[PDB]
């Protein structure tokens, strides 16, 4: 019974690999010869936000490119204004450890999650004069590592118990469940069309789940180590991975295999968070040697290096306009690069 | 253009109030000390927090919280577990911890190997290399009653009990047989085997002995903490 299923799975994987080898006529490193180079991108820190006490773990840019959210391990969620460097709201959290924070596309809700296995949604209207807890949800057995807002009514959450969940803010119960992973689901990312989303875990693979049907479509298993961050391409047909393997990988939802690897022999530290720009030519990835490297998404060459942090950069965010990049590190610092 | 100036002054006043509240909370945050208790499921880690709570806030949701106050010192003890066995992904969060309370069980030598491996992996961690871990030897009365009744497995599972002596000279607890002292010191010397090769001057290991029921534990930690902040400060002014 066991051997007849194991050899069946083995020949299935061999057939899938033969298919990948059949559809692979060439690589992207052979067609990118007659392409103009970008050059040395010299970015400078314009503003410096100093309001965090403990280490900053994650952030999320807004849809208006005006306000951003940030979470630290002190127990507070800080909303920053990137223009005048002013804090408009400060919500004292009940727990001290938070691993993810998400800003709603409408600007009325904000979600936060951490080691308490509880996602706390706060409303930002503030009619009475102080912030209050709208509805907190607790239905996981692992740990909340990532959360994203699909709309003002639905939220996608990544748990550390091999289960991804889609919660509804009104009723507070799980609409669907995604059980396809075999390890702690690290992060997930939303497509601009909000129809399908890719999530990366510590299994050296990313899974492309659907929000309507409730199942996964493709599994890209070509990585080597625990994938940390996943970022869609601005078009919605491909994405990139960032992990501690010191190599950034690019996958596509239609190619179903690798596209191009970004590696270098003079670097040994891993990647913490990746984020594409508005165009997709430059890929910003925060490394583990206290810097953020911007790479060319078509040449696999170091386009630029920003060494402005003295601690490990924990989060990197690019707004929808691409005018500024916010890099938050473990030294309670948020650098605003141009 | 007057409305823009008015809203700007309003936002500036809001920023001033937010900074005032931030400083007010930073005061109590800097006046706060945290401690992280690590151990196995069968290890005697609940008997420490029970005696920390019965003599001197507490929440039971995922992680156990413990509060004990001795000599005007705050302590937030965190007993962390409700998750799966993989404790290597969320271990980067516990980076600013003052000291790691590591407790082990001496009643089971086969169950002590995984605790020794966890201690080795914690000492060899790149993020926990600047945090001194305090080693506690819990369940000593059971070890004493087990080694004397028989079942000699200390030299079978560990082939190092035939070539060993008693370097330290102190016998306050024993009054019947120094074999229990030899068995309690061999485990300490085995735990301090690889702990002195990785860390040279970054973090220190403090082995401490305790029983199943004790009352001077919260004190014993405090003195250890009293040293942990000292040497760190001694390393903050380039003096050693």
């Amino acid at each position, epitope marked *: 019974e066991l051997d007849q299923l*194991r050899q069946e799975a083995e020949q299935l994987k061999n057939q899938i690999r033969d298919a990948r080898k059949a559809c692979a006529d060439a690589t992207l490193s052979q067609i990118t010869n007659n392409i103009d180079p970008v050059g040395r991108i010299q970015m400078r820190t314009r503003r410096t936000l100093r309001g965090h006490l403990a280490k900053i773990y994650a952030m999320h840019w807004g849809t208006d490119s005006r306000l951003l959210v940030s979470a630290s391990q002190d127990g507070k969620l800080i909303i920053w204004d990137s223009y005048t460097t002013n804090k408009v709201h400060a919500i004292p959290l009940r727990s001290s450890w938070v691993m993810t924070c998400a800003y709603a596309p409408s600007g009325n809700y904000v979600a936060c999650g951490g080691l308490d296995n509880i996602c706390s949604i706060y409303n930002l209207k503030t009619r009475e004069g102080n912030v209050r807890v709208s509805r907190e949800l607790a239905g996981h057995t692992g740990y909340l590592s990532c959360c994203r807002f699909l709309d003002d009514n639905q939220i996608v959450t990544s748990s550390g118990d091999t289960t991804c969940a889609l919660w509804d803010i009104e009723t507070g119960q799980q609409t669907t469940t995604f059980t396809g992973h075999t*390890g702690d689901v690290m992060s997930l990312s939303l497509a601009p069309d909000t129809r399908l989303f890719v999530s990366g875990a510590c*299994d050296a693979s990313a899974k492309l789940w659907d929000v309507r049907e409730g199942m996964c479509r493709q599994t890209f298993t070509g990585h080597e180590s625990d994938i940390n961050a996943i970022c869609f391409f601005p078009n919605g047909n491909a994405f990139a991975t960032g992990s501690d393997d010191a190599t950034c990988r690019l996958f596509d939802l239609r190619a179903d295999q690798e596209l191009m690897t970004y590696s270098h022999d003079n670097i040994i530290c891993g990647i913490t968070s990746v984020s594409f720009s508005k165009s997709g030519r430059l890929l910003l990835a925060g490394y583990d040697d206290f810097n953020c490297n911007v790479w060319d998404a078509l040449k696999a060459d170091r386009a630029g290096v920003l060494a402005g942090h003295d601690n490990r950069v924990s989060c990197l965010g690019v707004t929808d306009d691409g005018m500024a990049v916010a890099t938050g590190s473990w030294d309670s610092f948020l650098k605003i690069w141009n | 253009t007057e409305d823009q100036r008015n809203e700007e002054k309003a936002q500036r006043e809001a920023n001033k109030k937010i900074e005032k509240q931030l400083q007010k909370d930073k005061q109590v945050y800097r006046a706060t000390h945290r401690l992280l208790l690590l151990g196995a499921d069968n290890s005697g880690k609940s008997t420490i927090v029970k005696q920390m709570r019965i003599l001197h806030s507490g929440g039971t949701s995922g992680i156990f919280e413990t509060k004990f106050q001795v000599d005007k010192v705050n302590f937030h003890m965190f007993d962390v577990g409700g998750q799966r066995d993989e404790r290597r992904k969320w271990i980067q969060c516990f980076n600013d911890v003052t000291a790691i309370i590591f407790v082990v069980d001496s009643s089971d030598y086969n169950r002590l190997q995984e605790a020794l*491996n966890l201690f080795k992996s914690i000492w060899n*961690n790149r993020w926990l290399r600047t945090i001194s871990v305090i080693l506690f030897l819990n369940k000593q009365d059971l070890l004493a009653e087990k080694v004397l009744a028989g079942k000699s497995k200390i030299e079978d599972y560990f082939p190092e009990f035939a070539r060993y002596t008693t370097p330290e000279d102190a016998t306050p607890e024993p009054g019947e047989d120094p074999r229990v002292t030899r068995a309690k010191y061999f485990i300490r010397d085995e735990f301090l085997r690889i702990s002195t090769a990785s860390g040279d001057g970054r973090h220190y290991c403090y082995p401490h002995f305790t029983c199943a029921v004790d009352t001077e534990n919260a004190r014993r930690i405090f003195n250890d903490c009293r040293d942990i902040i000292q040497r760190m400060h001694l390393r903050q002014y380039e003096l050693l």
Partner: nanobody
Amino acid sequence: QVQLQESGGGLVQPGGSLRLSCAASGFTFSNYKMNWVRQAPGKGLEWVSDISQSGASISYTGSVKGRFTISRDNAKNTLYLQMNSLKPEDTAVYYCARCPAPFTRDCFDVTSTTYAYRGQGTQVTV
């Protein structure tokens, strides 16, 4: 693709000699640490031994210290495990596990949960 294939074993009388092979493919062998775990019938997992990147820092479990030998080959990308002076109580299911972090000496691969960085296992009964 991270995959580990174990070969060797079978019904062997105690007191003889045995050799197990661990074939690794899809990743760099000379930069990752490996180890061995065993599952006893009715008992949990237990570590056996480990090996450094170059192969100098080798540490065994006190149950079998001088009876087990492990050797890595980066040119062939393989691991060899020689076992002599077998004991009848050493029967277990063997797992040739690999450490997820490179350029280090710490590994968390002793738990019996859903782990995806090891082989299918070899049944060695005596």
